[PDB]
Amino acid sequence: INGFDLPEGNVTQENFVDMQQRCNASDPAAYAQLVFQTCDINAFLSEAVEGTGLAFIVFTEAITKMPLSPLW
Amino acid sequence: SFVGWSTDWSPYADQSIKVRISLKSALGDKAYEWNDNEMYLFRSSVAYAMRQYFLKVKNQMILFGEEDVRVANLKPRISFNFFVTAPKNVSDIIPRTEVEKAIRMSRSRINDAFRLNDNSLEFLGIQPTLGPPNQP
Amino acid sequence: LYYNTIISWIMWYLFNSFQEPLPWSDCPLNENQTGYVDECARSSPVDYFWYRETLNISTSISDSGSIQWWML
Numbered sequence: 001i002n003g004f005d006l007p008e009g010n011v012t013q014e015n016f017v018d019m020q021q022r023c024n025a026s027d028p029a030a031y032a033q034l035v036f037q038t039c040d041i042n043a044f045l046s047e048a049v050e051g052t053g054l055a056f057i058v059f060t061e062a063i064t065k066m067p068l069s070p071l072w
Numbered sequence: 073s074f075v076g077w078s079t080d081w082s083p084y085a086d087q088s089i090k091v092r093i094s095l096k097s098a099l100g101d102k103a104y105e106w107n108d109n110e111m112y113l114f115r116s117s118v119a120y121a122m123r124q125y126f127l128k129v130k131n132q133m134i135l136f137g138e139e140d141v142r143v144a145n146l147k148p149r150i151s152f153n154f155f156v157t158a159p160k161n162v163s164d165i166i167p168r169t170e171v172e173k174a175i176r177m178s179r180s181r182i183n184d185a186f187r188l189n190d191n192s193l194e195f196l197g198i199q200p201t202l203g204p205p206n207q208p
Numbered sequence: 209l210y211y212n213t214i215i216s217w218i219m220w221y222l223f224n225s226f227q228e229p230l231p232w233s234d235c236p237l238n239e240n241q242t243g244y245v246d247e248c249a250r251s252s253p254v255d256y257f258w259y260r261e262t263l264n265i266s267t268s269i270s271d272s273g274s275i276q277w278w279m280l
């Protein structure tokens with residue numbers, strides 16, 4: 001929505017694959033310099049959870065997003 | 073020579089600043105809609121910021137108005153370019169480096185007039201800088 | 209021998225609580241206060257509390273530094 005200037009309430013998770021094909025059919029030159037991250041679950045559910053990397057990197061990152069985070 | 077022309081170049085589009093506004097990110101289900109009365113309030117807030125910069129830094133009083141802020145390329149995402157002109161001299165464009173210093177001086181005042189928070193009111197090319205943390 | 213070293217890392221994370229902006233929640237700034245530190249911007253701010261502010265880890269096992277008094 002920043003490379004083609006669309007309003008924010010039109011592009012969401014339900015039709016992301018619908019409208020990215022509409023952008024290369026409209027401007028094939030302006031769509032080439034844009035980048036699109038490739039990410040899907042079972043790639044974030046399988047990561048480096050090595051020794052001393054769960055209580056210190058995984059739990060302490062999730063505690064800072066709860067309310068009353070010094071208590072947890 | 074080059075035979076042909078480009079429809080993207082303009083004689084004013086090197087002293088222009090791009091503004092991007094994300095209303096539904098800042099407020100969400102409770103945000104006003106951006107009609108042309110909001111564009112009038114934006115052009116008066118920029119003219120106010122140019123008045124405060126020339127008074128406190130350059131020691132001059134210049135009567136900038138909302139008709140001296142020229143808006144081009146209004147999109148639905150809510151994005152446009154603007155440049156500032158001397159009050160009745162239409163040929164005198166204030167440089168881009170002096171408008172960036174004027175907006176940095178009064179960015180906290182422009183944000184409060186629209187309830188935005190420096191991530192929903194972006195001046196492209198101007199970045200927030202300060203804020204060292206500590207207390208212990 | 210090593211099992212009571214993991215408890216000393218747990219005690220270091222218990223001493224570093226009792227403050228509402230938790231120390232692993234934000235990056236520090238540069239010498240020139242303009243941006244974050246270069247390896248806190250690429251990695252997570254939780255990785256710039258375990259690897260550089262707690263452990264102060266090095267690049268290999270073949271070079272070791274000093275005694276690191278706060279973990280003593």
Ligand SMILES: *[C@@H]1O[C@H](CO)[C@@H](O[C@@H]2O[C@H](CO)[C@@H](O)[C@H](O)[C@H]2NC(C)=O)[C@H](O)[C@H]1NC(C)=O
Nearest residue numbers: 087156157158159160161162163164165166167
């Ligand atoms: C309007 O602004 C222009 C500059 O944009 C002024 O033109 C200058 O005029 C002086 C003398 O008349 C020259 O020495 C400068 O070289 C001119 N500048 C440029 C960029 O050409 C013009 O005088 C201004 N008009 C009024 C009424 O103030």
Ligand SMILES: *[C@@H]1O[C@H](CO)[C@@H](O)[C@H](O)[C@H]1NC(C)=O
Nearest residue numbers: 006007008009010011012015
């Ligand atoms: C966004 O705009 C397009 C084109 O006007 C429209 O087809 C679409 O339904 C809109 N999305 C909404 C209203 O969520």
Ligand SMILES: *[C@@H]1O[C@H](CO)[C@@H](O)[C@H](O)[C@H]1NC(C)=O
Nearest residue numbers: 020021023024025026028031
């Ligand atoms: C636009 O890009 C997609 C791949 O992202 C490609 O399949 C499609 O053919 C492209 N369209 C044009 C007109 O080049």
Ligand SMILES: *[C@@H]1O[C@H](CO)[C@@H](O)[C@H](O)[C@H]1NC(C)=O
Nearest residue numbers: 237238239240241242243246
């Ligand atoms: C950052 O600031 C310090 C002052 O403590 C100075 O020595 C250093 O040269 C500065 N770095 C740059 C890139 O300007």
Ligand SMILES: *[C@@H]1O[C@H](CO)[C@@H](O)[C@H](O)[C@H]1NC(C)=O
Nearest residue numbers: 260263264265266267273276
């Ligand atoms: C460990 O920290 C000290 C200061 O606390 C610093 O002088 C030293 O360079 C650090 N070690 C490494 C390997 O960065």
